[PDB]
Amino acid sequence: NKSDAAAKQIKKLEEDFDGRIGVFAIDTGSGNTFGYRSDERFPLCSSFKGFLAAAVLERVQQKKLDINQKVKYESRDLEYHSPITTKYKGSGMTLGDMASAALQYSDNGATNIIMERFLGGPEGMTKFMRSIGDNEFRLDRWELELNTAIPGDKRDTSTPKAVANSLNKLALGNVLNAKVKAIYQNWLKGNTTGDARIRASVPADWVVGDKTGSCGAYGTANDYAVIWPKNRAPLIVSIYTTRKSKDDKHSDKTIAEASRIAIQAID
Ligand SMILES: *[B@@]1([O])OC2=C([C]=[C]C(F)=C2C([O])=O)[C]2[C][C]21
Ligand SMILES: [Cl-]
Ligand SMILES: [Cl-]
């Protein structure tokens, strides 16, 4: 009833913007869930940089990488949208600072360096997600080519559900020890690109961590979040969208509204 209506709201919302919306929301207290197109495929865009930061932390934790290790790149042609790597280029950044920049500012340079040097490229990225029991997620290509978001292209996609479950595992589950879990949570919390998405759908006094993607093509944008309400168990939210025509612009407000809806459905 509280779910059959939630779905109606989402279908109307996708029709409204001539597009396609995928949702998965978990209440980790009640075990309640809500889902619309949650097993349909959607492009990741930048949103996997959230999971890359987690992969770095797992390595870090196995004492295969030092979080404080200097990463040099003074002679690199930094990819477009590297706002943070660009500033430190003359001096390198720690591994920690590089991963968090991948997450928090969606920095392409940080992303690519980490995938090449420490994680085994996209295949390694996909392996890491398998290692935690995510079967849907796939990363095929690098920045920025992975952002094409061409309809029916399965490269570099996942499902809203697979994304949610995964976030749950990494942010709230037992893939990371207490120390590194806390860093991960902090990183998520300090994401700077998500104020118009899932965060705009919740009271100001809930803490949120999130990772957004914006493919910049076929109106494809997304956001995922861990939400900690005041007197309540953490929520997980997962919003994925595409649009019909290559030129369609992405809709921040549609993501926020889909977040409003999902949250009400698991409440
Ligand atoms: B990406 O998918 O992430 C991204 C880009 C541009 C602007 C954005 F706001 C964001 C985001 O939301 O993470 C480009 C780098 C790709
Ligand atoms: Cl970001
Ligand atoms: Cl964890």
The token pair that represents 124 in the structure block: 């390694």
> Hey, whose CA ends up nearest to atom 6 of ligand 1?
214
Residue 102, domain extent:
4-266
What CATH number does residue 21 fall under? 3.40.710.10
Ligand number, closest to the Cα atom of 178: 3
Q: Rounded to whole angstroms, how far apart are CA atoms 19 and 11?
A: 10
Q: Whose CA is closest to 209, among 109, 103, 98, 61?
A: 103
List, in sequence order, every residue forming a beta bridge with 214; answer none if it has no partner. 221
Say if residue 155 is exposed, middle or buried (CB neighbours under 10 Å; 0-12, 13-18, 19+): middle
Q: Rounded to whole angstroms, how far apart are CA atoms 25 and 8?
A: 16
Ligand 3 center from residue 157 Cα (angstroms): 23
The token pair that represents 214 in the structure block: 């914006």
What does the angle CA 46 – CA 51 – CA 56 come to, to the nearest 5 degrees? 120
The token pair that represents 211 in the structure block: 């990772």
The token pair that represents 13 in the structure block: 């919302």
Query: Which backbone phi and psi does 60 adopt, to 5 degrees?
Result: -40, -45
Ligand 1 center from residue 26 Cα (angstroms): 25
Query: Which backbone phi and psi does 127 adopt, to 5 degrees?
Result: -55, -45
Residue 214 Cβ contacting ligand 1 at under 6 Å: yes
Q: Rounded to whole angstroms, how far apart are CA atoms 258 and 6?
A: 9
Ligand 3 center from residue 57 Cα (angstroms): 10
Q: Rounded to whole angstroms, how far apart are CA atoms 198 and 257?
A: 8
Ligand 3 center from residue 184 Cα (angstroms): 9
Pocket test residue of 212, 223, 240 for ligand 1, highest count of atoms within 8 A of CB? 212
Distances (CA, A) of 111 to 5, 42, 125, 258: 40, 20, 11, 28
Q: Whose CA is closest to 99, among 130, 128, 77, 75?
A: 128
Report residues near ion ligand 2: CB below 5 Å.
106, 193
3-state secondary structure the chain: CCCHHHHHHHHHHHHHCCEEEEEEEEECCCCCEEEECCCCCEECHHHHHHHHHHHHHHHHHCCCCCCCCEECCCCCCCCCCCCCHHHHCCCCEEHHHHHHHHHHCCCHHHHHHHHHHCCCHHHHHHHHHHCCCCCCCECCCCCCHHHCCCCCCCCCEECHHHHHHHHHHHHCCCCCCHHHHHHHHHHHHCCCCCCCCHHHHCCCCCEEEEEEEECCCCCCEEEEEEEECCCCCCEEEEEEEEECCCCCCCCHHHHHHHHHHHHHHHC
Q: Is 257 a catalytic residue?
A: no
User: Which of these is catalytic: 30, 116, 145, 245?
Assistant: 145
Q: Are 228 and 210 in contact (CB under 8 A)?
A: no
Q: Rounded to whole angstroms, how far apart are CA atoms 199 and 42?
A: 21
Ligand number, closest to the Cα atom of 167: 3
Number of domains within the chain: 1
Q: Rounded to whole angstroms, how far apart are CA atoms 111 and 164?
A: 21
- Bond before 188 cis per omega within 30 degrees: no
- The count of other CB atoms within 10 Å of the CB of residue 122 is 18
Q: Are 242 and 223 in contact (CB under 8 A)?
A: no
Q: Is 145 a catalytic residue?
A: yes
Say if residue 89 is exposed, middle or buried (CB neighbours under 10 Å; 0-12, 13-18, 19+): middle
